[PDB]
Amino acid sequence: EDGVEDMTQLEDLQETTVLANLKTRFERNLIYTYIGSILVSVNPYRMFAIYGPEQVQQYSGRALGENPPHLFAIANLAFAKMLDAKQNQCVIISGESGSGKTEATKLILRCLAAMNQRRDVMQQIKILEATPLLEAFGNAKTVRNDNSSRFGKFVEIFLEGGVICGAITSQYLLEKSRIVFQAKNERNYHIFYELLAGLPAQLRQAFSLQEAETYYYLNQGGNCEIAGKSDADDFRRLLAAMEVLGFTSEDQDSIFRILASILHLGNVYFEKHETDAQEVASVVSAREIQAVAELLQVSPEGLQKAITFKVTETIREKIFTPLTVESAVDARDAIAKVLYALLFGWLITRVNALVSPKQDTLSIAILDIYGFEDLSFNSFEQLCINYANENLQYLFNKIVFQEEQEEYIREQMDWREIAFADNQPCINLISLKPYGILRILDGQCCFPQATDHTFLQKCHYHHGANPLYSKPKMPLPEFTIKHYAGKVTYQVHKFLDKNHDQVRQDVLDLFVHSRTRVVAHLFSSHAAQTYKAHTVAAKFQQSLLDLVEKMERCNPLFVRCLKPNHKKEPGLFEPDVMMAQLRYSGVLETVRIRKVRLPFQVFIDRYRCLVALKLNVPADGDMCVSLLSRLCTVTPDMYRVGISKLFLKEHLHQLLESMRERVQNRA
Amino acid sequence: DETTALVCDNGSGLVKAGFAGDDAPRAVFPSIVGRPRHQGVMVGMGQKDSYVGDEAQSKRGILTLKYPIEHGIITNWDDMEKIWHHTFYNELRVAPEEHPTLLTEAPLNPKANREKMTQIMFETFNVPAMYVAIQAVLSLYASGRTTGIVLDSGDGVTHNVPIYEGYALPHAIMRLDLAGRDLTDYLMKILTERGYSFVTTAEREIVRDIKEKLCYVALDFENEMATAASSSSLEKSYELPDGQVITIGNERFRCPETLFQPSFIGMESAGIHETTYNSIMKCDIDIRKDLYANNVMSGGTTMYPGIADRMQKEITALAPSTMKIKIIAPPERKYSVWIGGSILASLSTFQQMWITKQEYDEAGPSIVHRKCF
Amino acid sequence: DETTALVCDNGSGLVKAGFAGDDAPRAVFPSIVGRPRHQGVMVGMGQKDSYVGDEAQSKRGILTLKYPIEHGIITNWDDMEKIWHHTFYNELRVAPEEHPTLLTEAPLNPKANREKMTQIMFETFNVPAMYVAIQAVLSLYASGRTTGIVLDSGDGVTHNVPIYEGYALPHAIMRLDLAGRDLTDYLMKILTERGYSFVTTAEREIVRDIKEKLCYVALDFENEMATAASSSSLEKSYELPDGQVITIGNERFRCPETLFQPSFIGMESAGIHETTYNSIMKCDIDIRKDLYANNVMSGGTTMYPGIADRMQKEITALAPSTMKIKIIAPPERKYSVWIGGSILASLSTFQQMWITKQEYDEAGPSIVHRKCF
Amino acid sequence: DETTALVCDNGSGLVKAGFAGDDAPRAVFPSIVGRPRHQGVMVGMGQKDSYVGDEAQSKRGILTLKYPIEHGIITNWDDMEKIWHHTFYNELRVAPEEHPTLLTEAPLNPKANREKMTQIMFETFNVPAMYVAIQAVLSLYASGRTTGIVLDSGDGVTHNVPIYEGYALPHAIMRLDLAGRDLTDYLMKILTERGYSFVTTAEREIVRDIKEKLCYVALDFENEMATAASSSSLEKSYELPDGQVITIGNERFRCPETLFQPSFIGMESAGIHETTYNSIMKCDIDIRKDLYANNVMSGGTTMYPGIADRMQKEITALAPSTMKIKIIAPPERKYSVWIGGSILASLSTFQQMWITKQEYDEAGPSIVHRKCF
Ligand SMILES: Nc1ncnc2c1ncn2[C@@H]1O[C@H](COP(=O)(O)OP(=O)(O)O)[C@@H](O)[C@H]1O
Ligand SMILES: Nc1ncnc2c1ncn2[C@@H]1O[C@H](COP(=O)(O)OP(=O)(O)O)[C@@H](O)[C@H]1O
Ligand SMILES: Nc1ncnc2c1ncn2[C@@H]1O[C@H](COP(=O)(O)OP(=O)(O)O)[C@@H](O)[C@H]1O
Ligand SMILES: [Mg+2]
Ligand SMILES: [Mg+2]
Ligand SMILES: [Mg+2]
């Protein structure tokens, strides 16, 4: 009880004070600590006796304010705001992999499911049983965690007067580059290995799927031995769960065929063959091409024409243009990228369609967004993650500044003209059209003679003396951007090989002629729904813009997750990990904005016997600070005092020892 | 947001228009303004004093076809404005009041042409922003390189623009006024040897179509001259749009030979094969290493089958033996200018290089000579 | 610990840099600052106003090559700083904030040159300690002796510095301003006799390469003058970087003869063969015994094949008969200055002779005239 | 008796011939060899395969005009012999079998040119005695002095030859290949900006005549650039030989500005104003006192009105303030070379300096390199 659970209750806010308070709190299992309307949490790396059903019932309503912080409080307050405002809102959860964010989302989902008497309806659990497919499609091995979600999860569930209506799930961000290229000592998505592990022998020999060590799309990291960690059992469990959804066996066979074709697409080899005047393209063997065509039941000649020739056409003419080796490889990678992305979109659409959606009622939205990432060698993927986290941190800063402003207003009305930086230059350095880094890369993608190194020169000249841009001292192929979490370097390698989609119209038209209904219908829908989505960066920016234009009109509330230890160490807290997590989550932006309301009565009365200054102040107001100013030349900056608080106490840091030393010198 | 700046290549012959970003023009049609010449008798069939574009290609039997652009200089403006209005409204169905436009224009044309073009496209159409580029640079963009000698030969010009590492050489640019129109005229004047006469402007299109379909470039001119008089294998037939079939002998390859021996039509200047060589040896010394290996060509008149071989042979004969000669002949040369224009207009860096309406208003039409080039 | 003090020989032509202790420089490249001169047209290919070092040797067809050092006096500082910054960062990848640097500098150059060099390398680069030495003494170190007359002739100077038993003779130092640059200019002006013209700065490198590869020093000048007009055995051919092959006759040995008859280019002073003799007979009497036997030479311009024989013959003709003349011609003369600098910087005794930052701060740039020499 | 030795100045453009002693050439006409190109139809109007001299200037509408001399090097000999035969027989009506001839020739031309010239004029014409001189020295004779820097710029060369008290300075001679022909080509390429095209060789004479009649040198280039865009007073008109009248604006003084800013046509070397300064500061120190005061110039390209003022201003800006700059501009510069040749050939002392036929017979064409210079 000697500790403090609300950061607002703390008078002086320091990083050392925050870490000390958290270290004092965690022994008493105060995982949840209030910072106002924002709540954070830590991972105990163990199981806990679960917040019983009583916390859902008698701690709801106004009682959450007087209750100790808990996960159910934010959901209860969100439902209270639903009832009070009749408008939709959102709940956003952040953090790194292994911090229990998925488990936290499951817990909050079961809490909002059990808050009413409609728990006897199966649809409240059918949404949860269709979950494992998503993180099965979304988890890939990472240097920080073997089970890391590399996609953005959005779930929108309607609740009309406590009755849980249909739930709509959607995805916004997806690392399409990880489909074809993987970092060193890293794996692809687990489903590609699960198909290898759990497929029947007859289907394996019919599809020729025993070449995992040969597949170019899986051996990039050189680490396939982790695929034996109960992945066959996971495959069987996933098939059982998706059969619970009622997904037909023929459609499962179609999905397996498409995945096998995607994997076999990596077996296509291109070589420099002198056709007419320059070396253009060649294939060692068409057997892989024929297998790919037969898996989707498409004409092999058309696929070869599309992958080896770029076709331009108009009303009058149709002309085929031969493609170089690099361009052919890029197109072969991009077709697989779009195939996998559209498969994921179709499957999430099927999941949303299986559960019946209801009309437009009150709803609560939950975003499962991974937090800041910083590896040893940061690639384009890490740049995208940092940009998304920068936008999320901008929203967090806006909400925190609004809360601080309303606190000041409740304190004094003269704080309306107080404003701080809103992280705009950091976003504008990348998102602005004329000289944004992503925009510059997108422009350089179509340039005739564009290499990785020329991009460095373009960025260095265009940005130059920007305060947030950190040019490397030595001529190395990299640069550094100063985010809110500090300077982060980015090694420029294979950006031009990663930031290119350019899906042609002939490729789209070839697949809708296939005799499989699923892919033909899916590609027809994709063509019907589709702007400037030429490259991967443009698509990522468009998805982020769609997310923000979905979010802005809700004024949501966030919750933060932390990892007290780098690996599975229960109950171990160390300062360096605390600082790293605080920097990554952007929690220190709160104290940055705050720099508070110390009443001088405590300071005056504390030294009643030593300094012997009169403790008998009949009216504690402006006279004390005015006397301090007259005795120490205090700047007008220490003004706009409220009733007895709102003291920034900058000069007090040097005044305390000045007043202390003369008293001690007497002895 | 993304304004999707238009690219409207206004060549001497056909006109290519479309949106930036795409890999193919959205509108291809001859730039011909036709006016009726006969006396209308039926009531209600008149009141059409100008057929513009492709609709004037089918009704040409009663029209007089006039090209508003000859040799690349716009000699007629009242109908060029009509052609531009057609190309925008009746073809692309997009109002240029909220879309930037990017034009294509010859290297050594008179300045008054560009000034009047700028005046027309800012005052009448009220385009927010406009830019003028050189067709050779866009063609070089379309070839996926940054170093080479560009030989573009449309219907009015034939210009060599050598570029090295993105730096132009204005002292080595040579422009020739021998192009497809002169080839069509020479074919028309040489078909009369066999008895076929094409006098009115309506038959010029027939001659042009014959040239497009049947003409080809010989490898050795004298060898095929000897062969034609001793055999009938080179003879091919074409059908006029009235039922009668003509046969063309050695006039298939004697028509495009004017591009290599311009003394046929009275021109004194040598063919393009020697013009390229003389343009290359007007540059520095350590640059020919790349220019002899990056001989990129474009334009409509360069798809005559066999040109990329005779040109290479001639340049190899002219060039020193130790050096290597390479000819770049993409299969989409006639659309290379539009492809390069679309690539340029899609660059986010180029967005600063536009000529917005404020600068033109505060400077006038003379701003083209400083901003565009 | 061991700071591994750098040695960056900044000659009139090439620049040699590396670490002390090693027996070979780690960076050799011409000291040329080039700027583009043509009009850029491609978007994104500009924004490069200075190509420094070897990267400006391949793109010289569109650049203007300017030497920041002529005759050994640094006449341009803004680009010399660029060259030094390149040599450190972009080439050696070592920050000079924690590495001492040792410079090389001509004997009789103006004092302001050394003062400004010291100011630049302490203020901008913030080098902890710097020293300036004389190239002749380092060359003598590189020859493994402590007594001899050093004839170093780079691209800007040709100086004789006699040293006896480690004691210098400042009254006998003679410096001549005839060096490789004047030889290149004379070859360029004499090649026009056969019809070959090299006007722009880009062809100066071709002339220099021709001089490096084909030139040689005749033994008897008049005898080969007679031989050349009566035979074609001396003629050799070189290929320009465009395909055409030139043939050079008696201009192979008429170019380096300027070093022995400087009246060819208008200079009145006699050749180096007599300059060495006059420098030797400006010393004492009991010293010539060793100076005539230890005629060590270095510099780039002294590897013309046959120089060590003609020089010896001329000195023997000038010197008295009873005495013996010996010429020391190590096969690595052009790197002898750097070898000597590395040997000096590796000595633990020399560590006291540095100019640390404190002394410069308390004294200023004038400390060079007392500490370095 | 008095043989009246001929003087036949064979320049890059016009050719001046006459007798020694007189003060004016007896024959001025362009050195152009023309050949018919069209197909003759009338019987008896052919059999004329070469029109040489002024008679090829009126019939140029059916001829191809080829200059046998370019840049000052005789690149064509079969027609140069025809030109010489015309100049002697059909023009001067004197047999060279009994008259000595004195030639004019550029300073830094290839030796083979002089050797072949000597061979031609001794074997074919059988001239008893011949001599070759330098045009700059004869021009200096024509100015009535023996000390000054001669700037002669004809149609193929632009060379500075400083002479002091009758002694030449071969180490300070700088030759530039920018002359009247490049000015004509630049004017031809810049007239296309206004819409005027001159493609064939017959219109090159029209361009040259326009340059001769209307061109002038501006005093301050930027000031007149500003003035031209704000007024029409500088515009003047010329009439082509077909009836149509052209108007030329700021192209009158933008054509000869290439002589001062040769970067216009791609040349890197600076203008003649700085070339003269650099040639003067390649001489000794006690000589510039006279060279800055005796800046004699000649050649055809130096009568553009205003050159003697801009050149003086530029040299004064370059030269130190205390010194005085004087420009000598006689009104007969283009005939100064012939005047000097006639003055030299009339001297009785020079009669010993001839190359008689016996010496050539016993020595061969190589005697030119010893006797003439
Ligand atoms: N297959 C062909 N063979 C010969 N000539 C052709 C062929 N196709 C097109 N052309 C010529 O190309 C010309 C069209 O060129 P165009 O694309 O209009 O150039 P620009 O756009 O520069 O004016 C036509 O006049 C036609 O004569
Ligand atoms: N094989 C060679 N023959 C003749 N001259 C040479 C040869 N090699 C180099 N040189 C000359 O040496 C010069 C380089 O000298 P350099 O090492 O720069 O001297 P420093 O370092 O004192 O300036 C070049 O200008 C070149 O002309
Ligand atoms: N009034 C003039 N203004 C400008 N240029 C002129 C004028 N008169 C003659 N020229 C130029 O002078 C050239 C003739 O020079 P020329 O006497 O032939 O010299 P050279 O005899 O040395 O060849 C012509 O090419 C012409 O362009
Ligand atoms: Mg064109
Ligand atoms: Mg040296
Ligand atoms: Mg002359």
Residue D268 and residue C64: Cβ atoms within 8 Å? yes
Q: How far is CA A452 from the centre of its chain?
A: 27
Q: B236 touching A, CB under 8 A? A: no
Ligand 1 center from residue B153 Cα (angstroms): 8
Question: Is C37 touching D (CB cutoff 8 A)?
Answer: yes
Q: Tokens 């199966």 map to which residue?
A: A122
Sequence-distant (≥ 6) Cβ neighbours of residue B256 within 8 angstroms: B183, B215, B216, B217, B301, B304, B307
**Quick check: B263 and D37 CB within 8 A?**
yes
Token pair for A40: 């954070």
Q: Which long-range contacts (CB under 8 A, 24 or more apart) does A567-572 make?
A: A568/A45, A569/A45, A570/A44, A570/A45, A570/A46, A571/A26, A571/A44, A571/A45, A571/A46
**Which residue's alpha carbon is nearest to atom 4 within ligand 2?**
C212
CA distance B11 to B158: 12
Return the H-helix or E-strand segment holding A618. none
* Token pair recorded at residue C176: 């001549």
Give the active site residue among A138, A266, A371, A436. A371
Q: Does D263 touch chain C (CB under 8 A)?
A: yes
Q: Is A24 helix (H, G, I), strand (E, B) or coil?
A: helix
**Interval between CA C42 and ligand 1 midpoint (Å):** 26
Main-chain phi, psi angles of D252, to 5 degrees: -70, -45
Sign of CA dihedral B324, B329, B334, B340: negative
Please give, rounded to a whole number of angstroms, the shortest distance from the CA of C240 to a CA of chain B: 8
- What amino acid occupies position A119? R
The answer to whether A23 is annotated as binding is: no
Query: Annotated catalytic, A94?
Result: no
Active site includes A208? Answer: no
DSSP 8-class letter at A270? B
Please say whether the beta carbons of B360 and B126 come within 8 A: no
Task: Look at residue B207 and give its three-state secondary structure.
Answer: helix
Taking the C-alpha atoms of residue A666 and residue C146, their distance in angstroms, rounded to an integer, is 75
Active site residue A514: no
Q: Which residues pair with D236 in a beta bridge?
A: D248
Collect all residues with Cβ–Cβ distance below 8 Å to A24 and sequence separation of at least 6.
A2, A3
Alpha helix locations (H) across A421-463?
424-431, 437-445, 452-463
3-state per-residue secondary structure call for chain C: CCCCCEEEEECCCEEEEEECCCCCCCEEEECCEEEECCEECCCCCCCCCCEECCHHHHCHHHEEEECCEECCEECCCHHHHHHHHHHHHHHHCCCHHHCCEEEEECCCCCHHHHHHHHHHHHHCCCCCEEEEEEHHHHHHHHCCCCCEEEEEECCCCEEEEEEECCEECHHHCEEECCCHHHHHHHHHHHHCCCCCCCCCHHHHHHHHHHHHHHCCCCCCHHHHHHHHCCCCCCCEEEECCCCCEEEECCHHHHCHHHHCCHHHHCCCCCCHHHHHHHHHCCCCCCCHHHHCCCEEEECHHHCCCCHHHHHHHHHHHHCCCCCCCCEECCCCHHHHHHHHHHHHHCCCHHHHHCEEHHHHHHHCHHHHHHHCC
Q: Which of B155, B214, B335 to mutate to test the pocket of ligand 1 (most atoms within 8 A of CB)?
A: B155
Cα separation of A204 and C125, whole Å?
A: 66
Residue of D nearest to B369 (CA): D193
Residues D190 and D178: their CA atoms lie apart, in Å, by 17
Tokens in use for C41? Answer: 């047209």
CA–CA gap between residue A533 and residue A540 (Å, rounded): 9
The reply to whether A371 belongs to the active site is yes
- Distance of CA D155 to CAs B189, B274, D74, D178, Å? 42, 25, 13, 8
Residue type, A586: G
In sequence order, what DSSP letters do the residues of D177-200 get, joined into one string? Answer: ---HHHHHHHHHHHHTTTT----S
| Residue A8 DSSP symbol | T
Burial code of A395-414, b = ≥16 C-beta within 10 A, e = fewer?
bbbebbbebbeeebeebeee
Question: D222 has which bridge partners?
Answer: none
Q: Which residues, listed in sequence order, are joined to residue D28 by a DSSP beta bridge?
A: D16
Task: Judge whether A373 counts as a catalytic residue.
Answer: yes
- How far, rounded to the nearest angstrom, does the alpha carbon of residue B284 sit from its chain's CA centroid? 29
- Domains belonging to chain D, first-starting first, are 4-32+69-132+335-371 (3.30.420.40), 33-66 (2.30.36.70), 134-179+269-330 (3.30.420.40), 180-265 (3.90.640.10)
The answer to whether the CB of B159 falls within 8 A of the CB of B301 is: no
- Count CA atoms closer than 13 A to D373's CA, side-chain side: 18
Query: What is the nearest CA distance from A453 to chain C, expressed in angstroms?
Result: 13
Beta-carbon separation of B349 and C61 below 8 A: no
Beta-ladder partners of B10: B15
- Residues of B within 8 A of A458 (CB-CB) are 349
DSSP state of D39: -
Going from the C-alpha of B182 to that of each of B9, B179, B186, B215, the distances in angstroms are 21, 6, 6, 14
Would you call A98 a catalytic residue per the annotation? Answer: yes
List the single residue in B2, B25, B327 with the smallest CB-CB distance to A314: B25
- CA nearest neighbour of A326 among A313, A310, A341, A337: A310
Report how far residue D297's alpha carbon sits from residue A541's, in angstroms, rounded to the nearest whole number: 70
Nearest to C45 among B165, B292, B322 (CB): B165
Half-sphere exposure of D371 (CA within 13 A, CB side): 22
Cβ(A67)–Cβ(A59) under 8 Å? yes
Report how far ligand 2's centroid is from the alpha carbon of C185 (Å): 14
Q: Which residues neighbour A550 within 8 Å (Cβ) at sequence distance 6 or greater?
A: none
Q: How far apart are CA B301 and CA B154, in angstroms?
A: 6
Residue of A8, A41, A76, A98 marked active site: A98
Task: Find which of B135, B281, B286 to mutate to test the C interface (most C CBs within 10 Å of its CB).
Answer: B286
From B205, B303, B333, give the residue whose CB has the most ligand 1 atoms within 8 Å, as the site to mutate.
B303
Give the CA distances from residue A108 to residues A103, C44, D276, in Å, rounded to whole numbers and listed in that order: 9, 52, 90
Element (H, E) at D201: helix D201-214
Query: Which one-letter DSSP state was computed for residue B59?
Result: S
Q: Determine if ligand 1 sits within 6 Å of the CB of residue B11.
A: yes
In DSSP notation, D277-339 reads HHHHTTS-STTHHHHTT-EEEESGGG-STTHHHHHHHHHHHHS-TTS---EE--TTGGGHHHH
Contacts of D37 in chain B (CB under 8 A): 263, 268
A381: number of Cβ within 10 Å: 20
- Cβ atoms within 10 A of the Cβ of B54, count? 15
In whole angstroms, what is the distance from residue C230 CA to residue A53 CA?
116
Rg, Å, chain C Cα set: 22
Whether residue D247 lies within 8 A of chain B, CB to CB, comes out as no
Structural Rg of chain D based on CA atoms: 22
C43 to B138, C52, D149: CA distances (angstroms) = 11, 22, 47
CA A311 to each of CA A319, A383, A532, A666, C123: distance values in angstroms, whole numbers, following the listed order: 6, 33, 20, 93, 60
| The token pair that represents C239 in the structure block | 């290929």
Q: Which amino acid is at C316?
A: T
Decide if D12 contacts D154 (C-beta within 8 A).
yes
Q: Name every chain D residue with its beta carbon within 8 A of the beta carbon of B370.
A: none
**Is the Cβ–Cβ distance between B188 and B207 less than 8 Å?**
yes
Nearest Cβ partner for B111 among D37, D193, D266: D193
The answer to whether residue A185 is catalytic is no
* Distance between A467 CA and the closest CA of chain C, angstroms: 21
H or E stretch at D55: helix D55-58
**Neighbours of C (≥3 Cβ pairs closer than 8 A)?**
A, B, D
C180 Cβ closer than 6 Å to some ligand 2 atom: yes
Q: What are phi and psi of A101, to 5 degrees?
A: -65, -40
Catalytic one of A60, A102, A139, A308: A102
A445 min Cα distance to partner chain B (Å): 9
Q: How far apart are CA B281 and CA B293, in angstroms?
A: 14
Angle between helix axes B307-318 and B272-280 (nearest 10 degrees) is 50
Write the residue in B163, B287, B288 that is nearest to C41 by C-beta.
Answer: B163
| Structural contact between residues A531 and A554, judged by C-beta atoms closer than 8 angstroms | no
Continuous segment of H or E residues that includes residue B97:
none
Tell me how many residue pairs between chain A and chain B have CB atoms under 8 A apart: 64
Residues of chain C found within 8 Å of residue B140, distances taken between Cβ atoms: 42
Beta bridge partners of D34: D51, D65
CA–CA dist C319, B284 (Å, integer): 51
Taking the Cβ of residue C61 and every Cβ of chain D, the question of whether any pair is shorter than 8 Å is answered with no
Say if residues B35 and B63 touch (Cβ distance below 8 Å): yes
Q: Which of A314, A441, A500, A532 to mutate to test the interface with B (most CBs of B within 10 A)?
A: A314
Closest by CA position to B308, among listed B287, B322, B325, B291: B325
Chain B CB within 8 Å of residue C39 CB: yes
Cα C190 to chain centroid distance, Å, stands at: 23
Q: Is the CB of B158 under 6 A from ligand 1?
A: no
Asked if residues D127 and D100 have their Cβ atoms less than 8 Å apart, the reply is yes
| CA distance to A117, A415, A417, per residue, from D27 (Å) | 123, 100, 94
Taking the C-alpha atoms of residue B308 and residue B219, their distance in angstroms, rounded to an integer, is 10
**A149, A352, A391, A499: which is the annotated catalytic residue?**
A149
Does any ligand 3 atom lie closer than 6 A to the CB of residue D333?
no
Residue of A539, A465, A536, A462 lying closest to A499 (CA atoms): A536
After what residue numbers is chain D broken, C–N > 2.5 angstroms?
none
3-class SS of residue D175 = strand
- Kindly report the protein residue whose alpha carbon is nearest to atom 9 of ligand 2: C300
Count chain B–chain C contacts defined by CB atoms under 8 A.
Answer: 76
Q: Looking up tokens 């300094």, which residue turns up?
A: A611
Whether C33 contacts C130, CB under 8 Å: no
Expressed in angstroms and rounded, the spacing between residue B180 Cα and the centre of ligand 1 is 6
Spatial distance between the Cα atoms of D282 and A50, rounded to a whole number of angstroms = 97
Question: How close is the nearest chain C Cα to the Cα of D304, in Å?
Answer: 26
**Alpha-carbon span A510 to C316, nearest angstrom:** 90
Answer whether D139's CB lies under 8 Å from D336's CB.
Answer: yes
| Chain D nearest C-alpha distance from B149 (Å) | 17
Quick one: tokens of D144? 């009535």
Q: A608 by DSSP, 3-state: which?
A: coil
Q: Do B352 and A433 touch (CB under 8 A)?
A: no
3-state helix vs strand vs coil in chain B, percent to 5: 40, 20, 40
**Phi, psi dihedral angles at A257 (to 5 degrees):** -65, -45
Residue A99 assigned ligand-binding role: yes
Q: Would you say D174 and D279 are in contact if contact means Cβ atoms under 8 Å apart? A: yes
Between CA B276 and CA B109 the distance in angstroms is: 20
Residue A356 known to be catalytic: no
- For chain C, how far is it from start to end, CA to CA, in angstroms? 27
Q: Does C95 touch chain A (CB under 8 A)?
A: yes
Name the maximum alpha-carbon separation found in chain C: 74
Neighbours of ion ligand 4 (CB under 5 A): B 135, 152, 154
Specify burial of residue D243 (Cβ count, 10 A radius: 0-12, 13-18, 19+).
exposed
